[PDB]
Enzyme design. Sequence first.
Site, PDB file in Angstrom:
ATOM      1  N   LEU A  16       0.842  -1.382   0.114  1.00  0.00           N
ATOM      2  CA  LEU A  16       0.045   0.162  -0.057  1.00  0.00           C
ATOM      3  C   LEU A  16       0.948   1.254  -0.059  1.00  0.00           C
ATOM      4  CD1 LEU A  16      -2.671  -1.102   2.603  1.00  0.00           C
ATOM      5  CD2 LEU A  16      -2.852  -1.126   0.116  1.00  0.00           C
ATOM      6  N   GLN A  20      11.380   5.155   3.694  1.00  0.00           N
ATOM      7  CA  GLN A  20      12.434   4.648   3.990  1.00  0.00           C
ATOM      8  C   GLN A  20      12.179   3.796   5.253  1.00  0.00           C
ATOM      9  OE1 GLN A  20      15.676   7.313   4.494  1.00  0.00           O
ATOM     10  NE2 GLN A  20      17.115   5.844   3.484  1.00  0.00           N
ATOM     11  N   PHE A  21      12.900   2.589   5.289  1.00  0.00           N
ATOM     12  CA  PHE A  21      12.889   1.592   6.203  1.00  0.00           C
ATOM     13  C   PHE A  21      11.505   1.103   6.734  1.00  0.00           C
ATOM     14  CE2 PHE A  21      16.798   3.995   7.284  1.00  0.00           C
ATOM     15  CZ  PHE A  21      17.613   3.375   6.227  1.00  0.00           C
ATOM     16  N   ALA A  22      10.323   1.538   5.916  1.00  0.00           N
ATOM     17  CA  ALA A  22       9.240   0.734   6.297  1.00  0.00           C
ATOM     18  C   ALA A  22       8.235   0.585   5.007  1.00  0.00           C
ATOM     19  CB  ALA A  22       8.422   1.755   7.204  1.00  0.00           C
ATOM     20  N   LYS A  39       2.751  -3.137   8.714  1.00  0.00           N
ATOM     21  CA  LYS A  39       3.847  -2.257   8.511  1.00  0.00           C
ATOM     22  C   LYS A  39       5.266  -2.965   9.013  1.00  0.00           C
ATOM     23  CE  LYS A  39       5.272   2.557   9.871  1.00  0.00           C
ATOM     24  NZ  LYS A  39       4.724   3.607  10.771  1.00  0.00           N
ATOM     25  N   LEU A  92      -6.712  -1.478   8.934  1.00  0.00           N
ATOM     26  CA  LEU A  92      -6.780  -1.036   7.455  1.00  0.00           C
ATOM     27  C   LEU A  92      -7.609  -0.006   7.317  1.00  0.00           C
ATOM     28  CD1 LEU A  92      -5.926  -1.723   4.637  1.00  0.00           C
ATOM     29  CD2 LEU A  92      -7.615  -3.431   4.698  1.00  0.00           C
ATOM     30  N   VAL A  93      -6.931   1.116   6.770  1.00  0.00           N
ATOM     31  CA  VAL A  93      -7.478   2.352   6.485  1.00  0.00           C
ATOM     32  C   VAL A  93      -7.369   2.572   4.888  1.00  0.00           C
ATOM     33  CG1 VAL A  93      -7.939   4.815   6.587  1.00  0.00           C
ATOM     34  CG2 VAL A  93      -7.187   3.348   8.538  1.00  0.00           C
ATOM     35  N   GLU A  97      -6.270   8.972   0.660  1.00  0.00           N
ATOM     36  CA  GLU A  97      -5.961  10.312   1.144  1.00  0.00           C
ATOM     37  C   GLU A  97      -7.065  11.238   1.235  1.00  0.00           C
ATOM     38  OE1 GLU A  97      -2.265  11.797  -0.567  1.00  0.00           O
ATOM     39  OE2 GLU A  97      -1.321   9.825  -0.265  1.00  0.00           O
ATOM     40  N   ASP A 136       3.994  14.616  12.471  1.00  0.00           N
ATOM     41  CA  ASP A 136       4.103  14.567  11.256  1.00  0.00           C
ATOM     42  C   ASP A 136       2.576  14.762  10.574  1.00  0.00           C
ATOM     43  OD1 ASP A 136       5.492  13.817   9.027  1.00  0.00           O
ATOM     44  OD2 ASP A 136       5.231  11.540   9.174  1.00  0.00           O
ATOM     45  N   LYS A 138       0.157  16.041   7.914  1.00  0.00           N
ATOM     46  CA  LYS A 138       0.221  16.349   6.710  1.00  0.00           C
ATOM     47  C   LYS A 138      -0.572  15.816   5.949  1.00  0.00           C
ATOM     48  CE  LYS A 138       3.987  13.133   5.657  1.00  0.00           C
ATOM     49  NZ  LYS A 138       5.338  12.858   5.075  1.00  0.00           N
ATOM     50  N   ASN A 141      -1.092  11.570   5.658  1.00  0.00           N
ATOM     51  CA  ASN A 141      -1.229  11.328   7.102  1.00  0.00           C
ATOM     52  C   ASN A 141      -2.683  11.431   7.540  1.00  0.00           C
ATOM     53  OD1 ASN A 141       1.028   9.825   7.078  1.00  0.00           O
ATOM     54  ND2 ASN A 141       2.199  11.344   8.435  1.00  0.00           N
ATOM     55  N   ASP A 158       0.379   7.078  10.923  1.00  0.00           N
ATOM     56  CA  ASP A 158       1.699   7.202  10.819  1.00  0.00           C
ATOM     57  C   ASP A 158       2.137   7.833  12.106  1.00  0.00           C
ATOM     58  OD1 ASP A 158       4.301   7.525  10.094  1.00  0.00           O
ATOM     59  OD2 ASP A 158       4.129   8.651   8.405  1.00  0.00           O
ATOM     60  N   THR A 177       8.283  16.771   6.777  1.00  0.00           N
ATOM     61  CA  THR A 177       8.192  17.060   5.366  1.00  0.00           C
ATOM     62  C   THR A 177       8.229  18.716   5.684  1.00  0.00           C
ATOM     63  OG1 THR A 177       6.837  15.326   4.786  1.00  0.00           O
ATOM     64  CG2 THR A 177       6.759  17.200   3.411  1.00  0.00           C
TER      65      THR A 177
HETATM   66 CL   LIG Z   1       7.900   4.213  11.191  1.00  0.00          CL
HETATM   67 CL   LIG Z   2      -1.438  11.393  -3.342  1.00  0.00          CL
END
Ligand SMILES: [Cl-]
Ligand SMILES: [Cl-]
Length: 299
Positions: A16, A20-22, A39, A92-93, A97, A136, A138, A141, A158, A177
């Site tokens: 989905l 980076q790293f997830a 995740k 699960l969402v 967005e 975070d 934004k 999320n 997140d 961000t």
């Molecule tokens: Cl994370």
């Molecule tokens: Cl988008």
Amino acid sequence: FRQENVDDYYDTGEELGSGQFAVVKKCREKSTGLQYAAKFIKKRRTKSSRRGVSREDIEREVSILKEIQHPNVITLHEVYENKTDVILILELVAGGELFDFLAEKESLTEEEATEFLKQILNGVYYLHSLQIAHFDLKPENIMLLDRNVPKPRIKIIDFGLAHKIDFGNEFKNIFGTPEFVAPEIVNYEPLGLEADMWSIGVITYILLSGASPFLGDTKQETLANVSAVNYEFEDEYFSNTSALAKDFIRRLLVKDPKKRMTIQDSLQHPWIKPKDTQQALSRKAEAVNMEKFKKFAAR
Ligand SMILES: [Cl-]
Ligand SMILES: [Cl-]
Ligand SMILES: [Cl-]
Ligand SMILES: [Cl-]
Ligand SMILES: [Cl-]
């Protein structure tokens, strides 16, 4: 964490998303048939490695997720761990967005925009009541549970940067961000719940205009715009916007976090809870629509 093979208990599938790293995948629990998002977070494992997330940062995200339960925040179901990854089995969402859903509409009034904003405010009010800063916030999320229903339900996701603020501020460098982080994040200053309120101001600005208020032509310029609080209600994008909306935004995009509107005050602000009908009818003005999103994406 459960030190077993997640594959013994879940069938995994479509990716989905991945940073980076997830990586996040759809999955189904064998014992119940229920679907979730898994995740997988890469551990760096050794402190001197740069190939993953600190297992301590992971521990922080999980301990926050376990505490929270609210209809506008994502729910944590289970946590597994193997030698390389920590795997969060999350609600699960699937509705996508919020802003992608709003980009599909021909028209949106300020009143309609506040019905979604209010769900964000409700979720953040719950978090801040627990002294949790999300750090975070934004558009990416802010997801929808189901985009087809008449009143879609917002989920804040997140919690990778979220922190408990027990001393009123934390001194940590946050890599967020640039368009959405508060000036105290840009300047590597102490950080509090107030930083979320700044991000809500940015989200609200975009929600009404389709434009990003501090977005510059280079990444460093965006960070400088944020630090200088350089934004404008450009008449090309805010021609219809009510004074109440601009006041709500003006009280959130404030350099000094101690002078910023709190989550509690934002929920009482007349743009969110009008005190008379003259205020309420001013929210019939036009917010963002399909053409404003595409007018700014053209840059
Ligand atoms: Cl994370
Ligand atoms: Cl988008
Ligand atoms: Cl300091
Ligand atoms: Cl201004
Ligand atoms: Cl205040």
